[PDB]
Amino acid sequence: KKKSITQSNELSPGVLKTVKVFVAIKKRIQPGDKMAGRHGNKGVVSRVLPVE
Amino acid sequence: SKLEFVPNIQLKEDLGAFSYKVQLSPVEKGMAHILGNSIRRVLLSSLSGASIIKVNIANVLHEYSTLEDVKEDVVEIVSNLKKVAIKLDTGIDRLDLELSVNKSGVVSAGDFKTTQGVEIINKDQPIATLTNQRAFSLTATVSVGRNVGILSAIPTELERVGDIAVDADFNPIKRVAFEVFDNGDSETLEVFVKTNGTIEPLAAVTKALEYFCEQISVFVSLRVP
């Protein structure tokens, strides 16, 4: 858990430190996204209608 | 003609879970389907309510997180804080609830600290499960509003560090229908409303009609204000 090579690898000779950053986002469906069913029928969402 | 009918509102048939049947008994033979449609379309779109719009769990920085001894992740807890049906009072318009426990079982919606003016309607709504005994604390923010639609909305500004935004379903009406019956010289409009619990059928339908009449009242003058 600490027995690394001070970078857990050679750290790309010529490079000192490598830092990674993870970003997460949520994505709702919208007009333009592609939908499909298991029977070979696809299509693009054109409108989100109000419920009434 | 002297046959001027003006309908009166009634609450026949309180049925089911939160299902009812409002009724408008004397209607003027032609004007009933208009009222049925306008009521159904204004209930399902313009009613205001209250819901949780932001949460702040204690030892939690973001939503894609995890707590010890808790059987859920924060993405699944913020998903249960959306089914909590709250009933605010007249002029509060905003407040912060509080939850805090030290038990070892299913945390529920009944576990919010008793604030005055607030009232949780579904009390056995699960929120989290503690599988071992520990201290679980969060502060939900409650607000009023209506479903103004997807694009235009409120971004729910965040102030402290652990604030997560919850997207609310403010409308309290779940499913409407209507029917029209013949009496002879008059008809009977019969509305079926199903709510979540934070409003009563008569008050709901008269609020719908208040909205509809304030809309119709611009064609009696053809004037802006």
Name chain B contacts of A24, Cβ cutoff 8 Å: 64
3-state secondary structure of B116: coil
- Whether the CB of B40 is below 8 Å from some CB of chain A: the reply is yes
Query: For chain A, how far is it from start to end, CA to CA, in angstroms?
Result: 58
CA distances from A13 to A5, A6, A10, B63, B130 (A): 12, 13, 7, 37, 48
Under 8 Å CB pairs connecting chains A and B tally to 10
Contacts of B98 (CB under 8 A, 6+ apart): B112, B113, B115, B137, B139
Residue type, B152: S
Distance CA(B107)–CA(B116), nearest Å, equals 21
Are the C-beta atoms of residues B118 and B147 closer than 8 Å to each other?
Answer: no
Method: cryo-EM
Distance CA(B164)–CA(B55), nearest Å, equals 5
Is B149–A24 a contact, with Cβ atoms under 8 angstroms apart? no
Q: Where are the strands (E) in A1-52, listed by range?
A: 34-36, 42-44
Distance CA(A34)–CA(B212), nearest Å, equals 38
Query: Burial letters for B92-122: b for 16+ Cβ neighbours within 10 Å, e otherwise?
Result: eeebebebebeeeeebbbebbeeeeebbbbe
Name chain B contacts of A52, Cβ cutoff 8 Å: 40-41, 44-45
Distance CA(B122)–CA(B195), nearest Å, equals 12
Give the torsion sign (CA, B23, B26, B31, B32).
positive
